[PDB]
Amino acid sequence: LEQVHLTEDGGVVKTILRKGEGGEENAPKKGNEVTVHYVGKLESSGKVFDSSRERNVPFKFHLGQGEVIKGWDICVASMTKNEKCSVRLDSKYGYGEEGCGESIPGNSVLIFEIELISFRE
Amino acid sequence: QETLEQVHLTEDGGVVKTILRKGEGGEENAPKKGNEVTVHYVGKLESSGKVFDSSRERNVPFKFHLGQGEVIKGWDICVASMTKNEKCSVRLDSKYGYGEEGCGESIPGNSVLIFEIELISFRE
């Protein structure tokens, strides 16, 4: 087991499933475009609400710029190339009391399996 | 402040586009279902005027595949109607946005959204 508490409130907890390359040169940096695959589920039901794997299209975003939910910017910033994790996000690090659309109720804990495939600038 | 034509893209008034800058003419200049489009956008709540998301602030154009349901419905409908270099303002009723649930701290349930969208480019 390695369950990394990335925030001190226990709201972002990254369980490492497969260790990445591990280097200092090996983590993305702020403003980098990252490429990931992910599978997102609600903790409450365990049901998947979004999967880039199902779409067969890797997801790209720019790190640390608020293009994704807070818990993603925190989690991905902690990953190394080829790392696969399962991250548990309290609602404060996801969509909060409001929720998001039909699939994510208010105050939902989200669990994402994230695999960091590559990054560049 | 110019008097600008509004283009209704649905029969229910829920997606209404105002062209601020006309894009390039022709069909070669309209994106097709499945194309990767690149846009800049600024999204605000109609009720308060608060900006909830802006690719312009990030200085990073946003890319998605058109017509796949990978963006809110009003975006699939609006961008399908644009041509290269068009800049528009589109008003989305919540049916075409985030619905009764809303989306995070900045988008309440049943919110009308206003997006300024610029279609920068697209490709297969």
Domain annotation for chain A: domains and CATH numbers: 2-121 (3.10.50.40)
Kindly list the residues from chain B whose CB atom is less than 8 angstroms away from the CB atom of residue A64. Answer: none
Residue of chain B nearest A97, judged by CA positions = B104
Kindly list the residues from chain B whose CB atom is less than 8 angstroms away from the CB atom of residue A38. Answer: none
Q: Is A104 on the interface with B (CB under 8 A)?
A: yes
Strands B87-92 and B51-54: unpaired
Q: Is B73 helix (H, G, I), strand (E, B) or coil?
A: helix
Burial of B124 (0-12, 13-18, 19+ CB in 10 A): exposed
**Known catalytic residue at A49:** yes
Strands B51-54 and B36-45: antiparallel
Determine the straight-line distance between the first and last CA of chain B, rounded to whole angstroms: 36
**Known catalytic residue at B62:** no
Kindly list the residues from chain B whose CB atom is less than 8 angstroms away from the CB atom of residue A101. Answer: 98-99, 101, 103
Secondary structure of A53-93 as H, E, C letters: HHHCCCEEEECCCCCCCHHHHHHHHCCCCCCEEEEEECHHH
- CB-based contact B90:B114 (threshold 8 Å): yes
**Known catalytic residue at B115:** yes
Residue of chain B nearest A121, judged by CA positions = B60
Q: Is B67 on the interface with A (CB under 8 A)?
A: no
- Nearest C-alpha neighbor of B6 from the set B20, B25, B26: B20
Q: What are phi and psi of A54, to 5 degrees?
A: -65, -35
The answer to whether the Cβ–Cβ distance between A100 and B98 falls below 8 Å is: yes
Tokens of A26: 């090996």
The answer to whether the Cβ–Cβ distance between B102 and A105 falls below 8 Å is: no
The answer to whether the Cβ–Cβ distance between A65 and B70 falls below 8 Å is: no
Q: What are phi and psi of A70, to 5 degrees?
A: -55, -45
Q: What is the stated resolution of the deposited model, in angstroms?
A: 1.4
Q: Is B107 on the interface with A (CB under 8 A)?
A: yes
Kindly list the residues from chain A whose CB atom is less than 8 angstroms away from the CB atom of residue B60. Answer: 62, 65, 67
- CB-based contact A65:B60 (threshold 8 Å): yes
Neighbouring C-beta atoms of residue A63, cutoff 10 Å: 21
Angle A52-A58-A60 from CA coordinates, rounded to 5°: 110
